[PDB]
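Objective 1b of the project was to move from sequence-level analysis to a structural picture of ligand recognition. The entry below was assembled by the postdoctoral researcher (A.K.) and checked by the PI before modelling. It contains the amino acid sequence of the target and the SMILES of the bound compound, zinc ion.
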Amino acid sequence: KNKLFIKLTRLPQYYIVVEMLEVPNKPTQLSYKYYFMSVNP
Amino acid sequence: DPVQRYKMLIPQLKESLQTLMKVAAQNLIQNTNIDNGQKSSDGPIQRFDKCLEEFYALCDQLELCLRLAHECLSQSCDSAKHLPYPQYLAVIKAQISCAKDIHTALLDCANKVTG
Amino acid sequence: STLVDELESSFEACFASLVSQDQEEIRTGVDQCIQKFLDIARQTECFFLQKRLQLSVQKPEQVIKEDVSELRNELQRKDALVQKHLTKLRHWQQVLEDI
Amino acid sequence: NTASLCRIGQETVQDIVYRTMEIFQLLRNMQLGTYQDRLTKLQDNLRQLSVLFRKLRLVYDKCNENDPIPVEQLIPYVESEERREIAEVNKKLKQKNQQLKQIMDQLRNLIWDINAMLAMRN
Amino acid sequence: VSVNLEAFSQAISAIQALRSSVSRVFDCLKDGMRNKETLEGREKAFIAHFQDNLHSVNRDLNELERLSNLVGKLYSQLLQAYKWSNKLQYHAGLASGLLNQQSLKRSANQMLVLPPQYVDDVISRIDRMFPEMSIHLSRPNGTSAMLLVTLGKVLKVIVVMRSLFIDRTIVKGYNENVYTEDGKLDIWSKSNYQVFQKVTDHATTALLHYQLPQMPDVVVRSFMTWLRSYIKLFQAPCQRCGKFLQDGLPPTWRDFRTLEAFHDTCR
Amino acid sequence: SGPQAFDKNEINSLQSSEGLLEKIIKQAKHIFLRSRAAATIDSLASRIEDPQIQAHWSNINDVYESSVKVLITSQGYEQICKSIQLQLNIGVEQIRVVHRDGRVITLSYQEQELQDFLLSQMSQHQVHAVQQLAKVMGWQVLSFSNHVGLGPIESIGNASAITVASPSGDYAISVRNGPESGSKIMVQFPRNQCKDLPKSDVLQDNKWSHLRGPFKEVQWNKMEGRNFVYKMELLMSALSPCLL
Amino acid sequence: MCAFNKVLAHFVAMCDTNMPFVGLRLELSNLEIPHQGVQVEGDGFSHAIRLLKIPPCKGITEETQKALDRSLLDCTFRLQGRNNRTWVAELVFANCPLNGTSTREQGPSRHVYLTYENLLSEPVGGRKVVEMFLNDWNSIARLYECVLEFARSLPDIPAHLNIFSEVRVYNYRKLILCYGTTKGSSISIQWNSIHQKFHISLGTVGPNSGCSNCHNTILHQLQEMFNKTPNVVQLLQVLFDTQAPLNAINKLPTCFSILPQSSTHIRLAFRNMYCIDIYCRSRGVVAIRDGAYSLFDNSKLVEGFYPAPGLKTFLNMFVSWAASIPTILTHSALNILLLPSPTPYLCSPLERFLG
Amino acid sequence: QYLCQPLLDAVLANIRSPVFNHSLYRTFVPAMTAIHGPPITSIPSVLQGEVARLDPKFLVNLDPSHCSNNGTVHLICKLDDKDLPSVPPLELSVPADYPAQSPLWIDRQWQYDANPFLQSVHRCMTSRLLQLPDKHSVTALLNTWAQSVHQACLSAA
Ligand SMILES: [Zn+2]
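Corresponding predicted holo structure:
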């Protein structure tokens, strides 16, 4: 539920989705996951 | 007048086109009926060439009228672009002399560059 | 031959439609004259830059001489600016003293 | 010397094109006393341009008089008292620039203080 | 008027086209059928060319008729000078445009002080044109002139100059109080809405964009020309997405040199 | 407020007694933030000499606002390269940046943000200078990417790139400038001019010795010039037909 | 200071510079133009789409297609300009048929740079970009046909044309011939695939001519004669014939109205009543006539022109209804008959006759 | 159509007569010639284009073995790059009528054994080959080969 949708504006229908997750041992670091969504209600 | 002459010349132009196309078809059908083996009446065949030059004469009248009117209207536009009659002649000789001055300045210095 | 003279000839060719004794004729003539004019101008600049490059690789003391001259002009220009500013400051001190 | 003559020759070609542009602007604005003033400006511009052409042919002949190394041998691919004069003038205007920075900072601060104090009076 | 000039030149070319197309019909019929390998192919080619020529004659006649529907109505030395003046003016316009698009000037170096009366004359000259813009100069702080440009019932722009060169701009809405308590201009404020803060940002890019080095009259005139295009806010749609609203914003970007509306997200 | 009907916001704005301490602390915050911004701009003007950087503070301030105009031009080409200009609006705890090309960026009160921002702007200037210089010298701008996406990852901001072509074909020049790893610049020769190029037996015609197949890299120090754009102009003139 | 997150900025920049090529790859594949894929080009910091074979063409010979497809080397597409939506295709040709007096006399690989920008609707790689590219390639083909014929005929040319005109510019998109004895006038031929015509455009470039091209009165019929038969040597012959008559005719006052009929058939009309035909012909000969008469029924007269009495005798000096038959001249007697001499106000001889 | 129809009916009635152009000549040439005056005054080169534009990583040469100067052609490439490791040479079989079809990679499973690293090269290469669009070039094969070598360097370490 902690994500960020970055829409590209020069070409819409394209999103880069950043998902932030907690690294288990380090409590003061984050881990990022980058996805590439496309979209056509 | 030139607009009204133009309105005069348009239906004459359509008439000449109609007669030219129909007479072309008549002469071609007669010549094919002689060339292929066919009977055909000689009749009032009404030559093609006169219709063709008549159409060209109408187009000359049209282009003549339109070139005249276009020259007249462009003339009036630049005339408005540029009250005693001697004051008119004074500013007219002023304008002619000034344009002559610009032209001779350009010519003399474009020659002063080389040759 | 001798790019100066082609520059002169093309520059005189830019004016050839005016000095003698509608729109599209003027447009194509202007475009062709101006394009050849700018092309020979760029070739002349290219020649001067190539000659400067050969001088800067062969005879580098001249470059250092020009740098010496430019830094000296920078010094004199800075001193002129500060002198004008200082005179204006002293005039404004004499103004603000009198209130 | 000659490596500043090349600079002057570049500047002449840069000035000729700009001057022709100004000439064409003058011919654009000329509407058939200010008639005579535009005539004078046109003739003076044309005079200066002819001077520039003569100067350009001079600079061309001077640099073309004074090559054993062809170009494209001059680019680095991967695989003495005048130097002291340079260092002297460099140190000199280093000090001059730092003093100019102090003058500029004090002027900035005085302007900011004047504007703040005068802004609060209302 | 110029529309009669254009319609007459148009119909001149229409007559020339009609005459040449009729002669082209009869010339292509003079030559007769060509060879063209396939017999079916040669028949097709001849029929197609004849049909195209006939259609072109019909189109030219129709265009002449349409122009007919739309038409409306020592001395030689003066006309020669008139023609040569218009020729020189058009020639100089084209050559000046081509040359100032491509300048070779690299630096100003080789080898601001103005009367406020001149600023007032310039800005009143701009205020005389654009009848929907009213510009009201005032000088509350020294020689730096401050301008209120109202614009329709849409905008109030506060322009802060410095020696006849625009420095800062702030765009506020119509109702918004641009005055302080004492009735002076509020030079330092924002406009409570998203739209007008976006237009302040676009106006700052506009004053950063229209920069001639020396002559400042073209700068202020071009800035007011660009600013005049904002009168169609809330009415123009975006020329990229068609809609009016992206994230609840009207198209706030009037593009320089072609004053078209865009949402700034649509660049 | 009664007849000329006011909203909540105007009513609260008329009646809002802000104490002296908030006003004085906001003024001192703006003074300190403005002094830090002036210090970072002057430190970049002292340290970095490669593009240049200028500043023009405005005449008129408030107690909570000032403004600059930052140019970044190369040294001897101030008419060509006028494409990166900024305006910073130094508020109380924010610096609001308006670019020339419609990009609005709000920084924070730290002085590392403004330093990294102006470093990335100098890096983009080093490419826009070459684009507007190839405009002047007649060279043809093949490709231009303001923030390139291939290669090593740059720490401060993205990297820019062009590639231009010589007006008579043959040579090409590619620049890739980045804020931390600057100026990998490399020419492209035609074939039949490298001569260390290992030829292949598939090409049996001589027409393919005119395409520009090879790519060598220019060592940028030891190139003559006291500037970047000066060095680019000398490099562009070197790859022209030797007119003499 | 690790507060920048360099990886996300890199991924966003990578998507925004790479993803314009994907739509172009799809629109190229829908029109079945063979291409190597989206590749990193040379240095690492770029991208390109190189075509392999542009689809032949429509409506040109197979000799021209075999001569095109053996002269092309490369047709890369690159993306440039701000917003990253300006394509530039770099065609490079080998074996150019004819050089120019502009100094493109170098090594025989010419580069043609086409540039396309789609609108802000219809995205960056669309049908429109490839359609514009195919129209530009079609233009290059349909002018390359004429240039092939002209460069073939160039060694065996009628040798007065060889003094008359030299080639200034061949870009593969235009052909700018510069003609005149002093090489002061210029035609420019270019295929225009909106109208699917050729466009002949006339200009004066060079410091000896009139204030106009002097072929601008016959420009429409020149364009039509070229579109009927696109041959450059025909065009040079027509210019070589009609230059010396038209240069005299354009110095007439305007009273005198110039209606060009078909090319080499200028027809003058004094005021409205008087007409005179002019036929430029070969070898410096112009045949003039009476105009108002017929070429058919001699008794009948043309609709708007009244016959000029005594015209034949006046023309004979320079050399009933017998004005209707033509009377040839020299172009020098045409110069004398039309250039304004003072009287044996500076009027012409001919307008003195008709006056 | 309108104002032009009877000409069209005459000419479309009289096509396929061998004396047709005689009839057109006799009815039209005297009018026109009176008014208008008299008449007028080994290896397919697509592969050379690909090979001439390749990166200097690849070193594509023809096989000494195999049929030559005939329909299909056969290539033995190479790979030179400091970043990439030395790998088996790769064998390509380009058909005649090369565009509008996809070249084939001559598989040599036996040399891609005898190491874990070359096995990873081969697995990743067959994967990207399945991922390829149809009618790809030669350079698509060569670039999937170089990317496969790079992935097999990264996956290993
Ligand atoms: Zn939009």
